[PDB]
Design a protein around this ligand. Structure first.
Ligand code: HEM
Ligand code: HEM
Ligand code: HEM
Ligand SMILES: CCOC(=O)c1cc2cc(-c3ccncc3)ccc2[nH]1
Ligand SMILES: CCOC(=O)c1cc2cc(-c3ccncc3)ccc2[nH]1
Ligand SMILES: CCOC(=O)c1cc2cc(-c3ccncc3)ccc2[nH]1
Ligand SMILES: [Cl-]
Ligand SMILES: [Cl-]
Ligand SMILES: [Cl-]
Ligand SMILES: [Cl-]
Lengths: 407, 409, 411
């Protein structure tokens, strides 16, 4: 039995509102790398099965991710924590997006959606995103100091979304608002916000966009998505595409930027090296270090033995990427922030398999462009005060972080 | 060979600004109960000796505290962490107060000053602190919501200091100001306040008090301390100043943080809060202090070679007593991670290890705790927190700067 | 005068030449008929440089004049290596500006001053006894094998142990230090087609920055403490600067000294009277005649920062000049009988370590001591060695390398 407090729950949002439980994950890797995480009645964050298998080793994460035929995303979704009193109906709605589907449905959507994440679609946004990154960093440097999350981390990921969807500048303000309103709904700072209403607004805007583009086809992703190659996103599916993209492409990359800069602030030797060399390998080490998604879950569709543990049909497994990305048997000096690290087989974008992050290259470009812009415009920036973390059971978020850009 | 990241330092203020390193402390207790905590050059929080011995077990904490003739408070003081660039002299000025003295100097001062903190002397403040506690809780309940630290935790410990000293009401504002000016000095929120200057202010005021009481003796505490006793012993004028400084500092943040973290414990354990409201048990104060452990760690310096639980402590080496670890020692408490306000016996070391330096204010602190929680139970029994607390950056103090709570619930 | 008698399109940096031979007669033809000569290069055939060609510098006095006028002849503008793979990306040339070799003043001046703390005569002399011990063991191990690859069993190890000893690299880490060092060069030869110098450099820098951090806490007697402790003016190598220093060393003092050893013994095998004299007298002047004969760095380049007239030839701003040390070290106007291998040659003003000036090899005396120590050990343990077959040369446009050389140590 691992040396943990009685009743300890790795999906407890109260933990992540304070800290990442690095030491507790290290104890699991050392003493029980696949450990049953029991959950008292009504304290399962919306699931009522008594607990889940905590997965803490990178190889087990990869095994679960590659065996999607067995470990299902559709069955219970991939988010392993909601409000304890959430309604099952409000969990199953997740199934309307590609992330929480199984083959064959998922296979079909994935193939169509790939049209929007080709090296062309991504690479074409480089010049505008580079321009926007440089302006953002310039604006922050002129301000002298402020909330790094709002002034440096937030905009560029959202502009990458808008650019990819070809959203007109006039509607980006409201688009960004709706996207943000579906973030951090479990944290008291946002407890007054109705995310269901914002999702309905996004779906609506997405439909006008798809209908408008059907009548006026152009050389851009949305038209490629509603156009038939005879496979094409249905009007509805395109709305759920936008919702999923407005959500998946926002907080995760944002939080990679905040926590990457926190890493640089704590390891100035790495910041001095970065500013000189600008290594393209930095983005992956920032994603490994930041692990913006702490965990996604799966559900066993049949009995499966994983590293000597008998997982039973119907049981949940929770893949703790935050643990796996510091696996002492995979990484040399996992607790060293090393922007030259290469190869870097982290699972911050998930394990290799059917659901691997389709936006990983877009995320890497966003990260490299903003940090290049930070190095260009505020090379001497230093933190003012401690970051404020997000209350979430599965997202690793930084809400606010005060920084002095002039140093 | 504990399972810790390379370079981990248990006195690193950056840790405590975020969290209490509970799991890391537990790993030491399990795999290396006495462990050399190496510190790089220039990262010893004012000390330049390569590191210190981490003490994580309760019996070890007590053995060190009982053997004060070996483990000195004077050689390097008891605070284990300052700003890295602190001058040595600024560390050595600590020795002017009882806490950082060794026998025989300490023995005499403790004998004289203890007269002001007896059960009787403490009991004298009960009524005025009870009335104040009730008013504090009423005024907070009426505000509906706010920062629990400021509205409930901060004032009553300061009024206990002023009451013990007999400070006129008109002077309490500036007394509280200088007392707080010597707090939160390693945290960016209060990085712009000078401790040494304020200590001079406190000392100057104490001189005016001693000078006045020599002219108009009264039946209070300042007069007793400046009056020769039956054995011809008394605090000198300088000694009285450092007593006020010691009191103004020692009676403030620690009790404040026991109240804040006691209420946090109650909020995370609603069954215990219901029991407290119904029963108001006399064991709750000690369990609150065990859970809060407001002083995370105090240090000693070995005056000679000493073998401690099979480890060889060499002369000149520092040992750091981590009360935060000892108070959750699984061998002493069967269920340390249970918050049990009926815990009895409760051999916690929140007030230190028994010995020559055991907190003389423990009875005063327990009364302050009991009075304010009785008042909270009376006036806002349904309070619940709004947002997460904001912790204090410090290498040895366990502090909560702010905590928003809905008193009405 | 007439044009030099060279094949049309001949390129003195062509790696395909050096994989087979040293172009000795071609260099001699330039010295006689066109001592400063425009080496044209066809589109896409410039080894990473796309400017139409360069000036071939073949006379020792011209090499010295360029090396001394570093204010005009820049190392930083295009780096000093004159040949990479034809398709190398410009960004992969410019990243090499982070080592001291490819820096101009004032950045070069500061770094060299700091680095000098690690190459004092005292620091290098402190390595004499350990390197002597290891040389004798190397030669004894080789002789006990009876026959084998002289490059691998005699030439390779001592230069790497010199680097390791200078830096104070623990014994358990020397294996990977040596691996990283060997992965830095040769990538144009089919034998090394799979090496990744970018990756090697990154792993070395990461290792080196960790060592810098560790050795700040516990200072040792190596040069690392000297390099990373600030002086009065606060001058010291940063951790990443120490990393680029280690990269520079792992490169600059590995294959160069190795190839001096291999070609020194190649020369002794062709000149047995010199070998008999060496065994008898053990003259340390041999090390400099060996470096002159071996010229392990065939050529380094510079770039003109302004128009400059050099021995009657108008060099134009922006043009590259390539200093062919291999030609200058056989310059008939400086050396008496340059094509005689003479281990007593004295004075021996060769430019195998470069021309005097700002970038002159800081490791020259460590190199000479390594050479004298290994050849004493070879003389002591295999005085009768004899080659079995012909050396295999390295495909490089600027390094004069021997990959393999089979020899019978017992004779
Ligand atoms: C650092 C930034 C990001 C991180 C850490 C991240 C993380 C992840 C993870 C862990 C998964 C699921 C892995 C699995 O279950 O196998 C995933 C999938 C996904 N990601 Fe990301 N992501 C990032 C950026 C983005 C961006 C920028 C986009 C869109 C612009 C995006 C869109 C998606 C989508 C649509 C999926 C579902 C794929 C599927 O179900 O087939 N992500 N991402
Ligand atoms: C919850 C509240 C408090 C806590 C957690 C606490 C904690 C401690 C601890 C752990 C020590 C041990 C010193 C050592 O062994 O090195 C100590 C000593 C001391 N405390 Fe407290 N204390 C509290 C309240 C107070 C109050 C209210 C006062 C005075 C009004 C006070 C005055 C002192 C003094 C003077 C000493 C030094 C005694 C000596 O050196 O003989 N403390 N305290
Ligand atoms: C026979 C062996 C060697 C040869 C033929 C050689 C050759 C050279 C040459 C030609 C230069 C450039 C000089 C110039 O541009 O003026 C140089 C520079 C350099 N060498 Fe050596 N070298 C040898 C051994 C070593 C060793 C053993 C070390 C150190 C362990 C070393 C370290 C360096 C460094 C750091 C530079 C750069 C100096 C600067 O740019 O200021 N070399 N070497
Ligand atoms: C109920 C649905 O709404 C959410 O609760 C929510 C889903 C979600 C997904 C990501 C994500 C997924 C894959 N790749 C990157 C990011 C991020 C935040 C999310 N929130
Ligand atoms: O800075 C400071 O010199 C400082 C000293 C100090 C002492 C206490 C204390 C000691 C014993 N008992 C209760 C409280 C608390 C805060 C303190 N700060
Ligand atoms: C840490 C950043 O990475 C580098 O320091 C780096 C080294 C390096 C070497 C070459 C190279 C050298 C010789 N021959 C061909 C290529 C190219 C790029 C490089 N980058
Ligand atoms: Cl000092
Ligand atoms: Cl108990
Ligand atoms: Cl340039
Ligand atoms: Cl000569």
């Amino acid at each position: 039995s691992p040396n943990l407090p009685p009743g300890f729950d790795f999906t407890d949002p109260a933990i992540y509102a304070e800290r990442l439980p690095v030491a507790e994950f290290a104890e699991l890797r050392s003493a029980a790398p696949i450990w049953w995480n029991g959950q008292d009645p009504g304290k399962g964050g919306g699931f009522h099965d008594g607990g889940f298998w905590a997965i803490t080793k990178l190889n087990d994460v990869k095994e679960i991710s590659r065996h999607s035929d067995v470990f299902s995303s559709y069955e219970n979704g991939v988010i392993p924590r909601f409000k304890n009193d959430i309604a099952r109906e409000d969990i199953e709605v997740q199934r309307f997006v590609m992330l929480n589907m199984d083959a064959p449905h998922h296979t079909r959507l994935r193939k169509i959606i790939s049209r929007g994440f080709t090296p062309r679609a991504v690479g074409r946004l480089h010049d505008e995103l580079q321009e926007r990154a440089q302006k953002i960093a310039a604006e922050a440097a002129a301000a002298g100091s402020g909330d790094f999350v709002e002034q440096v981390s937030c905009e560029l990921p959202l502009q990458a979304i808008a650019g990819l969807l070809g959203v007109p500048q006039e509607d980006r303000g409201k688009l960004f608002h709706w996207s943000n309103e579906m973030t951090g709904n479990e944290d008291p700072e946002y407890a007054h916000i109705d995310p269901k209403a914002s999702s309905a607004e996004l779906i609506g805007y997405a439909m006008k966009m798809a209908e408008e583009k059907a009548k006026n086809p152009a050389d851009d992703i949305v038209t490629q998505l509603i156009q038939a190659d005879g496979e094409k996103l249905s009007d509805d599916e395109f709305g759920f595409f936008v919702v999923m993209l407005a959500v998946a492409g926002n907080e995760t990359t944002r939080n990679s930027i905040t926590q990457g800069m926190m890493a640089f602030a704590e390891h100035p030797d790495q910041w001095e090296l970065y500013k000189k060399v600008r290594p393209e390998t930095a983005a992956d080490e920032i994603v490994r270090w930041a692990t913006p998604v702490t965990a996604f879950q799966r559900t066993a569709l049949r009995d499966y033995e994983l590293s000597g543990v008998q997982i039973k049909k119907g049981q949940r497994v929770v893949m703790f990427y935050r643990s796996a990305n510091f696996d002492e048997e995979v990484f040399q000096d996992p607790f060293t922030f090393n922007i030259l690290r290469n190869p870097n087989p982290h699972v911050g974008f998930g394990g290799t398999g059917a659901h691997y992050c389709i936006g990983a290259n877009l995320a890497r470009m966003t990260i490299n462009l903003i940090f290049n812009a930070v190095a260009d415009h505020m090379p001497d920036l230093k933190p003012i005060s401690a970051p404020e973390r997000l209350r979430s059971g599965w997202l690793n978020g930084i809400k606010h972080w005060q920084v002095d850009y002039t140093g």
